[PDB]
mmCIF file of C-alpha atoms and ligand atoms in Angstrom:
data_model
loop_
_atom_site.group_PDB
_atom_site.id
_atom_site.type_symbol
_atom_site.label_atom_id
_atom_site.label_comp_id
_atom_site.label_asym_id
_atom_site.label_seq_id
_atom_site.Cartn_x
_atom_site.Cartn_y
_atom_site.Cartn_z
ATOM 1 C CA UNK A 556 85.730 105.622 102.224
ATOM 2 C CA UNK A 557 88.016 105.500 99.246
ATOM 3 C CA UNK A 558 90.164 108.710 98.757
ATOM 4 C CA UNK A 559 91.617 108.720 95.294
ATOM 5 C CA UNK A 560 94.660 110.879 94.632
ATOM 6 C CA UNK A 561 93.958 113.652 92.049
ATOM 7 C CA UNK A 562 96.956 115.747 90.739
ATOM 8 C CA UNK A 563 96.291 119.512 90.944
ATOM 9 C CA UNK A 564 95.213 120.317 87.407
ATOM 10 C CA UNK A 565 98.123 120.979 85.111
ATOM 11 C CA UNK A 566 100.889 120.902 87.696
ATOM 12 C CA UNK A 567 104.180 119.143 87.327
ATOM 13 C CA UNK A 568 107.388 118.471 89.336
ATOM 14 C CA UNK A 569 108.789 121.955 88.827
ATOM 15 C CA UNK A 570 105.610 123.594 90.214
ATOM 16 C CA UNK A 571 105.937 121.578 93.475
ATOM 17 C CA UNK A 572 109.673 122.228 93.638
ATOM 18 C CA UNK A 573 108.716 125.971 93.672
ATOM 19 C CA UNK A 574 106.441 125.544 96.731
ATOM 20 C CA UNK A 575 109.270 123.569 98.451
ATOM 21 C CA UNK A 576 111.841 126.306 97.570
ATOM 22 C CA UNK A 577 109.450 128.894 99.039
ATOM 23 C CA UNK A 578 108.955 126.963 102.400
ATOM 24 C CA UNK A 579 112.761 126.411 102.636
ATOM 25 C CA UNK A 580 113.606 130.139 101.959
ATOM 26 C CA UNK A 581 111.188 131.191 104.665
ATOM 27 C CA UNK A 582 112.794 128.560 107.054
ATOM 28 C CA UNK A 583 116.120 130.262 106.430
ATOM 29 C CA UNK A 584 114.689 133.676 107.039
ATOM 30 C CA UNK A 585 112.524 133.201 110.153
ATOM 31 C CA UNK A 586 115.423 131.588 112.071
ATOM 32 C CA UNK A 587 114.671 133.400 115.378
ATOM 33 C CA UNK A 588 111.462 131.460 116.344
ATOM 34 C CA UNK A 589 111.366 129.612 119.660
ATOM 35 C CA UNK A 590 114.785 130.867 120.952
ATOM 36 C CA UNK A 591 116.490 130.256 117.593
ATOM 37 C CA UNK A 592 115.294 126.732 117.096
ATOM 38 C CA UNK A 593 113.513 127.940 113.864
ATOM 39 C CA UNK A 594 110.148 126.597 112.426
ATOM 40 C CA UNK A 595 111.543 123.214 111.151
ATOM 41 C CA UNK A 596 110.458 121.222 114.288
ATOM 42 C CA UNK A 597 106.860 122.564 114.549
ATOM 43 C CA UNK A 598 106.391 121.885 110.763
ATOM 44 C CA UNK A 599 107.350 118.192 111.001
ATOM 45 C CA UNK A 600 105.066 117.935 114.102
ATOM 46 C CA UNK A 601 102.211 119.519 111.931
ATOM 47 C CA UNK A 602 102.796 117.007 109.103
ATOM 48 C CA UNK A 603 102.541 114.027 111.608
ATOM 49 C CA UNK A 604 99.507 115.401 113.485
ATOM 50 C CA UNK A 605 97.374 115.938 110.235
ATOM 51 C CA UNK A 606 98.391 112.335 109.268
ATOM 52 C CA UNK A 607 97.931 110.690 112.709
ATOM 53 C CA UNK A 608 94.181 110.980 112.948
ATOM 54 C CA UNK A 609 93.944 108.119 110.373
ATOM 55 C CA UNK A 610 91.968 105.035 111.229
ATOM 56 C CA UNK A 611 92.628 101.900 109.138
ATOM 57 C CA UNK A 612 89.244 100.308 110.007
ATOM 58 C CA UNK A 613 86.922 102.755 108.170
ATOM 59 C CA UNK A 614 89.507 104.877 106.215
ATOM 60 C CA UNK A 615 88.607 108.167 108.067
ATOM 61 C CA UNK A 616 91.165 110.945 109.055
ATOM 62 C CA UNK A 617 94.723 110.907 107.610
ATOM 63 C CA UNK A 618 96.410 113.711 105.495
ATOM 64 C CA UNK A 619 94.098 113.604 102.448
ATOM 65 C CA UNK A 620 91.291 115.992 103.299
ATOM 66 C CA UNK A 621 93.373 118.811 104.746
ATOM 67 C CA UNK A 622 90.735 119.092 107.561
ATOM 68 C CA UNK A 623 93.008 120.769 110.159
ATOM 69 C CA UNK A 624 91.873 123.954 108.386
ATOM 70 C CA UNK A 625 88.546 123.436 110.185
ATOM 71 C CA UNK A 626 87.851 124.734 113.703
ATOM 72 C CA UNK A 627 87.199 121.281 115.343
ATOM 73 C CA UNK A 628 90.578 119.789 114.420
ATOM 74 C CA UNK A 629 92.409 123.161 114.707
ATOM 75 C CA UNK A 630 91.217 123.635 118.295
ATOM 76 C CA UNK A 631 91.850 119.969 119.320
ATOM 77 C CA UNK A 632 93.792 120.134 122.783
ATOM 78 C CA UNK A 633 96.395 117.756 121.214
ATOM 79 C CA UNK A 634 97.133 120.307 118.537
ATOM 80 C CA UNK A 635 98.064 123.220 120.889
ATOM 81 C CA UNK A 636 101.030 125.141 119.487
ATOM 82 C CA UNK A 637 100.626 123.942 115.840
ATOM 83 C CA UNK A 638 98.833 127.289 115.074
ATOM 84 C CA UNK A 639 102.390 128.660 114.704
ATOM 85 C CA UNK A 640 103.171 126.184 111.876
ATOM 86 C CA UNK A 641 99.831 127.067 110.240
ATOM 87 C CA UNK A 642 100.571 130.788 110.415
ATOM 88 C CA UNK A 643 103.978 130.239 108.830
ATOM 89 C CA UNK A 644 102.601 128.338 105.857
ATOM 90 C CA UNK A 645 99.634 130.715 105.249
ATOM 91 C CA UNK A 646 101.569 133.391 103.114
ATOM 92 C CA UNK A 647 102.894 130.454 101.126
ATOM 93 C CA UNK A 648 99.379 129.202 100.381
ATOM 94 C CA UNK A 649 98.464 132.798 99.164
ATOM 95 C CA UNK A 650 101.509 132.677 96.899
ATOM 96 C CA UNK A 651 100.508 129.251 95.491
ATOM 97 C CA UNK A 652 96.629 129.177 95.707
ATOM 98 C CA UNK A 653 96.356 126.079 93.493
ATOM 99 C CA UNK A 654 98.057 123.570 95.967
ATOM 100 C CA UNK A 655 95.588 121.630 98.236
ATOM 101 C CA UNK A 656 95.796 122.055 102.105
ATOM 102 C CA UNK A 657 96.759 118.380 102.760
ATOM 103 C CA UNK A 658 99.464 118.587 100.075
ATOM 104 C CA UNK A 659 100.855 121.855 101.555
ATOM 105 C CA UNK A 660 100.721 120.682 105.288
ATOM 106 C CA UNK A 661 102.444 117.440 104.356
ATOM 107 C CA UNK A 662 105.121 118.984 102.066
ATOM 108 C CA UNK A 663 105.959 121.459 104.905
ATOM 109 C CA UNK A 664 107.196 118.370 106.888
ATOM 110 C CA UNK A 665 109.222 116.955 103.934
ATOM 111 C CA UNK A 666 110.858 120.364 103.318
ATOM 112 C CA UNK A 667 111.714 120.818 107.062
ATOM 113 C CA UNK A 668 113.406 117.392 107.372
ATOM 114 C CA UNK A 669 115.489 117.767 104.221
ATOM 115 C CA UNK A 670 116.497 121.318 104.991
ATOM 116 C CA UNK A 671 117.547 120.219 108.569
ATOM 117 C CA UNK A 672 120.094 117.904 106.899
ATOM 118 C CA UNK A 673 117.777 114.862 107.119
ATOM 119 C CA UNK A 674 117.410 112.087 104.507
ATOM 120 C CA UNK A 675 115.531 112.681 101.234
ATOM 121 C CA UNK A 676 111.783 111.782 101.788
ATOM 122 C CA UNK A 677 109.917 110.823 98.441
ATOM 123 C CA UNK A 678 106.686 112.832 98.344
ATOM 124 C CA UNK A 679 103.515 112.195 96.251
ATOM 125 C CA UNK A 680 100.951 114.894 95.232
ATOM 126 C CA UNK A 681 97.157 114.282 94.966
ATOM 127 C CA UNK A 682 95.436 115.103 98.307
ATOM 128 C CA UNK A 683 92.030 116.836 97.739
ATOM 129 C CA UNK A 684 90.421 119.175 100.245
ATOM 130 C CA UNK A 685 87.243 117.680 101.667
ATOM 131 C CA UNK A 686 84.252 119.257 103.443
ATOM 132 C CA UNK A 687 83.966 120.416 107.072
ATOM 133 C CA UNK A 688 81.854 117.362 107.980
ATOM 134 C CA UNK A 689 84.670 114.938 107.031
ATOM 135 C CA UNK A 690 86.714 116.486 109.900
ATOM 136 C CA UNK A 691 87.731 113.692 112.453
ATOM 137 C CA UNK A 692 86.515 114.113 116.036
ATOM 138 C CA UNK A 693 89.074 115.054 118.718
ATOM 139 C CA UNK A 694 90.875 112.294 120.678
ATOM 140 C CA UNK A 695 92.593 110.159 117.996
ATOM 141 C CA UNK A 696 96.073 111.483 118.686
ATOM 142 C CA UNK A 697 98.280 109.714 121.376
ATOM 143 C CA UNK A 698 98.838 110.493 125.089
ATOM 144 C CA UNK A 699 102.406 111.074 126.406
ATOM 145 C CA UNK A 700 101.849 109.679 129.929
ATOM 146 C CA UNK A 701 101.734 105.973 128.997
ATOM 147 C CA UNK A 702 103.838 102.892 128.395
ATOM 148 C CA UNK A 703 105.230 100.739 125.585
ATOM 149 C CA UNK A 704 102.063 98.639 125.352
ATOM 150 C CA UNK A 705 99.879 101.683 124.671
ATOM 151 C CA UNK A 706 102.447 102.952 122.057
ATOM 152 C CA UNK A 707 102.351 99.616 120.152
ATOM 153 C CA UNK A 708 98.580 99.386 120.300
ATOM 154 C CA UNK A 709 98.235 103.019 119.140
ATOM 155 C CA UNK A 710 100.489 102.682 116.158
ATOM 156 C CA UNK A 711 98.621 99.562 115.025
ATOM 157 C CA UNK A 712 95.601 101.839 114.150
ATOM 158 C CA UNK A 713 97.934 103.450 111.493
ATOM 159 C CA UNK A 714 99.491 100.122 110.796
ATOM 160 C CA UNK A 715 102.866 100.937 111.801
ATOM 161 C CA UNK A 716 104.947 97.956 113.138
ATOM 162 C CA UNK A 717 107.824 98.121 115.740
ATOM 163 C CA UNK A 718 110.701 99.263 113.540
ATOM 164 C CA UNK A 719 108.476 101.972 111.889
ATOM 165 C CA UNK A 720 107.444 103.212 115.348
ATOM 166 C CA UNK A 721 111.035 103.383 116.640
ATOM 167 C CA UNK A 722 112.300 105.168 113.430
ATOM 168 C CA UNK A 723 109.392 107.668 113.562
ATOM 169 C CA UNK A 724 109.985 108.502 117.218
ATOM 170 C CA UNK A 725 113.563 109.540 116.284
ATOM 171 C CA UNK A 726 112.049 112.912 115.225
ATOM 172 C CA UNK A 727 111.759 113.728 118.978
ATOM 173 C CA UNK A 728 115.394 114.837 118.884
ATOM 174 C CA UNK A 729 114.013 117.912 117.084
ATOM 175 C CA UNK A 730 112.538 120.899 118.884
ATOM 176 C CA UNK A 731 111.326 120.712 122.463
ATOM 177 C CA UNK A 732 108.248 120.227 124.662
ATOM 178 C CA UNK A 733 106.614 123.492 125.919
ATOM 179 C CA UNK A 734 104.680 123.743 129.221
ATOM 180 C CA UNK A 735 101.766 125.908 127.998
ATOM 181 C CA UNK A 736 101.187 123.577 124.958
ATOM 182 C CA UNK A 737 101.344 120.048 126.431
ATOM 183 C CA UNK A 738 102.062 120.179 130.259
ATOM 184 C CA UNK A 739 105.708 119.072 129.582
ATOM 185 C CA UNK A 740 108.946 121.124 129.413
ATOM 186 C CA UNK A 741 112.379 120.832 127.938
ATOM 187 C CA UNK A 742 114.533 119.732 125.045
ATOM 188 C CA UNK A 743 115.602 116.168 124.099
ATOM 189 C CA UNK A 744 119.239 116.841 123.288
ATOM 190 C CA UNK A 745 121.776 119.452 122.103
ATOM 191 C CA UNK A 746 121.312 119.492 118.266
ATOM 192 C CA UNK A 747 117.560 120.130 118.193
ATOM 193 C CA UNK A 748 117.252 121.683 114.688
ATOM 194 C CA UNK A 749 119.576 119.418 112.776
ATOM 195 C CA UNK A 750 118.284 115.881 112.034
ATOM 196 C CA UNK A 751 120.586 113.190 113.579
ATOM 197 C CA UNK A 752 120.361 109.873 115.640
ATOM 198 C CA UNK A 753 120.820 111.839 118.850
ATOM 199 C CA UNK A 754 117.439 110.755 120.412
ATOM 200 C CA UNK A 755 118.640 107.126 120.574
ATOM 201 C CA UNK A 756 122.170 107.962 121.860
ATOM 202 C CA UNK A 757 120.669 110.188 124.616
ATOM 203 C CA UNK A 758 118.163 107.534 125.578
ATOM 204 C CA UNK A 759 121.022 104.938 125.931
ATOM 205 C CA UNK A 760 123.688 107.227 127.498
ATOM 206 C CA UNK A 761 122.049 109.690 129.846
ATOM 207 C CA UNK A 762 121.359 109.105 133.510
ATOM 208 C CA UNK A 763 117.585 109.717 133.447
ATOM 209 C CA UNK A 764 115.698 110.605 136.628
ATOM 210 C CA UNK A 765 111.929 110.514 137.012
ATOM 211 C CA UNK A 766 110.560 113.857 138.246
ATOM 212 C CA UNK A 767 107.319 115.797 138.341
ATOM 213 C CA UNK A 768 107.369 119.107 136.406
ATOM 214 C CA UNK A 769 105.466 122.391 137.078
ATOM 215 C CA UNK A 770 102.326 121.014 135.372
ATOM 216 C CA UNK A 771 102.214 117.953 137.795
ATOM 217 C CA UNK A 772 103.131 115.530 135.051
ATOM 218 C CA UNK A 773 105.996 113.148 135.161
ATOM 219 C CA UNK A 774 108.962 113.151 132.872
ATOM 220 C CA UNK A 775 112.411 111.736 132.722
ATOM 221 C CA UNK A 776 115.102 114.425 133.320
ATOM 222 C CA UNK A 777 118.867 114.189 132.911
ATOM 223 C CA UNK A 778 121.868 115.978 134.468
ATOM 224 C CA UNK A 779 122.618 117.470 131.064
ATOM 225 C CA UNK A 780 119.443 119.550 130.885
ATOM 226 C CA UNK A 781 117.453 117.121 128.633
ATOM 227 C CA UNK A 782 114.034 115.459 129.049
ATOM 228 C CA UNK A 783 112.233 112.415 127.729
ATOM 229 C CA UNK A 784 108.497 111.725 127.782
ATOM 230 C CA UNK A 785 107.106 108.470 129.512
ATOM 231 C CA UNK A 786 106.222 107.211 125.984
ATOM 232 C CA UNK A 787 109.783 107.991 124.819
ATOM 233 C CA UNK A 788 111.344 106.292 127.831
ATOM 234 C CA UNK A 789 109.107 103.235 127.017
ATOM 235 C CA UNK A 790 111.331 102.418 124.085
ATOM 236 C CA UNK A 791 114.122 101.198 126.400
ATOM 237 C CA UNK A 792 111.686 99.407 128.778
ATOM 238 C CA UNK A 793 110.365 97.152 125.992
ATOM 239 C CA UNK A 794 112.856 94.448 124.763
ATOM 240 C CA UNK A 795 111.708 94.513 121.126
ATOM 241 C CA UNK A 796 111.861 98.362 120.923
ATOM 242 C CA UNK A 797 115.231 98.389 122.790
ATOM 243 C CA UNK A 798 117.100 96.294 120.173
ATOM 244 C CA UNK A 799 115.945 98.738 117.479
ATOM 245 C CA UNK A 800 116.960 101.845 119.542
ATOM 246 C CA UNK A 801 120.491 100.309 119.817
ATOM 247 C CA UNK A 802 120.666 99.703 116.090
ATOM 248 C CA UNK A 803 119.886 103.328 115.232
ATOM 249 C CA UNK A 804 122.277 104.623 117.949
ATOM 250 C CA UNK A 805 125.048 102.622 116.250
ATOM 251 C CA UNK A 806 124.002 103.490 112.704
ATOM 252 C CA UNK A 807 122.564 106.870 111.683
ATOM 253 C CA UNK A 808 122.339 105.796 107.955
ATOM 254 C CA UNK A 809 120.128 102.837 108.774
ATOM 255 C CA UNK A 810 118.060 105.274 110.885
ATOM 256 C CA UNK A 811 117.790 107.725 107.864
ATOM 257 C CA UNK A 812 116.769 104.997 105.456
ATOM 258 C CA UNK A 813 114.094 103.597 107.796
ATOM 259 C CA UNK A 814 112.761 107.042 108.908
ATOM 260 C CA UNK A 815 112.437 108.024 105.194
ATOM 261 C CA UNK A 816 110.329 104.917 104.361
ATOM 262 C CA UNK A 817 108.189 105.231 107.477
ATOM 263 C CA UNK A 818 107.475 108.984 107.332
ATOM 264 C CA UNK A 819 106.324 108.690 103.681
ATOM 265 C CA UNK A 820 104.098 105.763 104.686
ATOM 266 C CA UNK A 821 102.618 107.854 107.503
ATOM 267 C CA UNK A 822 101.890 110.802 105.085
ATOM 268 C CA UNK A 823 100.265 108.512 102.441
ATOM 269 C CA UNK A 824 98.007 106.367 104.702
ATOM 270 C CA UNK A 825 94.354 106.284 103.611
ATOM 271 C CA UNK A 826 95.156 107.433 100.008
ATOM 272 C CA UNK A 827 94.797 105.353 96.863
ATOM 273 C CA UNK A 828 97.244 106.279 93.994
ATOM 274 C CA UNK A 829 95.967 105.343 90.441
ATOM 275 C CA UNK A 830 98.937 104.010 88.362
ATOM 276 C CA UNK A 831 98.495 106.778 85.858
ATOM 277 C CA UNK A 832 99.632 109.026 88.774
ATOM 278 C CA UNK A 833 103.188 110.533 88.754
ATOM 279 C CA UNK A 834 105.965 108.559 90.569
ATOM 280 C CA UNK A 835 106.909 110.151 93.995
ATOM 281 C CA UNK A 836 108.955 113.301 93.552
ATOM 282 C CA UNK A 837 112.504 113.635 95.111
ATOM 283 C CA UNK A 838 112.938 117.423 95.740
ATOM 284 C CA UNK A 839 116.264 119.182 95.611
ATOM 285 C CA UNK A 840 117.398 121.181 98.606
ATOM 286 C CA UNK A 841 118.270 124.984 98.264
ATOM 287 C CA UNK A 842 121.879 124.014 98.591
ATOM 288 C CA UNK A 843 121.652 121.540 95.763
ATOM 289 C CA UNK A 844 120.089 124.268 93.567
ATOM 290 C CA UNK A 845 122.595 127.006 94.618
ATOM 291 C CA UNK A 846 119.848 129.076 96.271
HETATM 292 C C1 LIG B 1381 103.350 108.161 120.887
HETATM 293 C C2 LIG B 1381 103.815 109.182 120.005
HETATM 294 C C3 LIG B 1381 103.966 110.540 120.289
HETATM 295 C C4 LIG B 1381 103.598 111.312 121.396
HETATM 296 C C5 LIG B 1381 102.802 110.973 122.662
HETATM 297 C C6 LIG B 1381 104.140 112.573 121.146
HETATM 298 C C7 LIG B 1381 104.034 113.682 122.001
HETATM 299 C C8 LIG B 1381 104.657 114.949 121.917
HETATM 300 C C9 LIG B 1381 104.538 115.985 122.815
HETATM 301 C C10 LIG B 1381 103.728 116.036 124.119
HETATM 302 C C11 LIG B 1381 105.293 117.026 122.287
HETATM 303 C C12 LIG B 1381 105.485 118.442 122.828
HETATM 304 C C13 LIG B 1381 104.498 119.462 122.283
HETATM 305 C C14 LIG B 1381 104.679 120.887 122.814
HETATM 306 O O1 LIG B 1381 104.564 121.143 124.015
HETATM 307 O O2 LIG B 1381 104.903 121.810 122.027
HETATM 308 C C15 LIG B 1381 105.836 116.557 121.121
HETATM 309 C C16 LIG B 1381 106.648 117.322 120.260
HETATM 310 C C17 LIG B 1381 107.109 116.979 118.974
HETATM 311 N N1 LIG B 1381 106.703 115.863 118.341
HETATM 312 FE FE1 LIG B 1381 105.822 114.201 119.188
HETATM 313 N N2 LIG B 1381 104.847 112.576 119.997
HETATM 314 C C18 LIG B 1381 104.641 111.386 119.427
HETATM 315 C C19 LIG B 1381 105.053 111.054 118.127
HETATM 316 C C20 LIG B 1381 105.729 111.866 117.208
HETATM 317 C C21 LIG B 1381 106.076 111.484 115.917
HETATM 318 C C22 LIG B 1381 105.727 110.130 115.259
HETATM 319 C C23 LIG B 1381 106.672 112.628 115.376
HETATM 320 C C24 LIG B 1381 107.225 112.870 114.109
HETATM 321 C C25 LIG B 1381 107.435 111.923 113.060
HETATM 322 C C26 LIG B 1381 106.673 113.580 116.374
HETATM 323 C C27 LIG B 1381 107.236 114.843 116.251
HETATM 324 C C28 LIG B 1381 107.312 115.861 117.156
HETATM 325 C C29 LIG B 1381 108.113 116.974 116.990
HETATM 326 C C30 LIG B 1381 109.048 117.269 115.832
HETATM 327 C C31 LIG B 1381 108.014 117.698 118.178
HETATM 328 C C32 LIG B 1381 108.747 119.018 118.465
HETATM 329 C C33 LIG B 1381 107.807 120.218 118.249
HETATM 330 C C34 LIG B 1381 108.291 121.626 118.598
HETATM 331 O O3 LIG B 1381 109.482 121.830 118.795
HETATM 332 O O4 LIG B 1381 107.476 122.544 118.673
HETATM 333 N N3 LIG B 1381 106.102 113.134 117.482
HETATM 334 N N4 LIG B 1381 105.466 115.286 120.916
HETATM 335 C C1 LIG B 1382 112.521 114.267 123.722
HETATM 336 C C2 LIG B 1382 111.272 114.892 123.189
HETATM 337 C C3 LIG B 1382 110.024 114.351 123.154
HETATM 338 S S1 LIG B 1382 108.877 115.436 122.449
HETATM 339 C C4 LIG B 1382 110.087 116.617 122.203
HETATM 340 C C5 LIG B 1382 109.819 117.947 121.579
HETATM 341 N N1 LIG B 1382 111.277 116.185 122.642
HETATM 342 C C6 LIG B 1382 112.515 116.983 122.560
#
């Protein structure tokens, strides 16, 4: 496969900035979801799960085809709970029927991070919806019950190296795990709907205790009321990953700069951009626009 980026016919920066402004205004408004966490966390988890099916060996999966819209990917056990992020974005797709599904699912993630006080993420338009038979089979998304060796081997299929993997995993400060979705339960820190380096600081400063939860799965619990997954806890058990965790814990700006670069790379894997294509757009936040 080659997947060439094609701009939605006739659309420019200001059209996309209107879809972003509409996702951000609805984030402001539906602030009660999941005990007042808001939809920001499930929207960046939707943007990474539609991108994480990519396989570098044959160019299949990835964000291009917007295939989550199909039953097979939608009903994938690893995608339980993302139906909430889909339902949120659906009125917005009726308001802007011209934007592709992959472009909308991925911009939902960019909007959520920037509106949660994260770094600016450059975003590129051009994904094209593809047929139901291009939909990737289930089982390409990662297990939580595993170690640092599995994590490194997994992220190599998306050719993400160590620093990219540690920066990307910093998004687990956001939101929480839910027992009925994944068999895990609990938050990862205090500020779980503001984007900060808190995941790293909690992983270095809490007194973590291994326990089984109500689903019979193990997780790392702390006195404070926080939890970490086995794969999260892996980042301080591996010596290469641990020097990077310490770097981000001492420097949130370096974390922002590296998360920005890696999240964009994750959203654009498997897509060729012609050089006639527009440069990546930097969207303004509501606040920047006075809205
Ligand atoms: C080895 C990698 C990863 C594994 C095994 C993993 C696993 C999980 C699991 C089990 C949950 C809880 C789901 C639930 O019960 O609702 C979760 C939540 C979440 N994940 Fe990951 N994750 C990984 C990588 C990432 C990456 C790379 C991102 C983002 C760049 C990400 C973002 C999120 C977000 C934001 C949540 C919170 C969702 C919410 O509050 O509803 N994860 N993850
Ligand atoms: C720590 C962690 C891993 S997945 C998730 C949601 N949290 C809060």
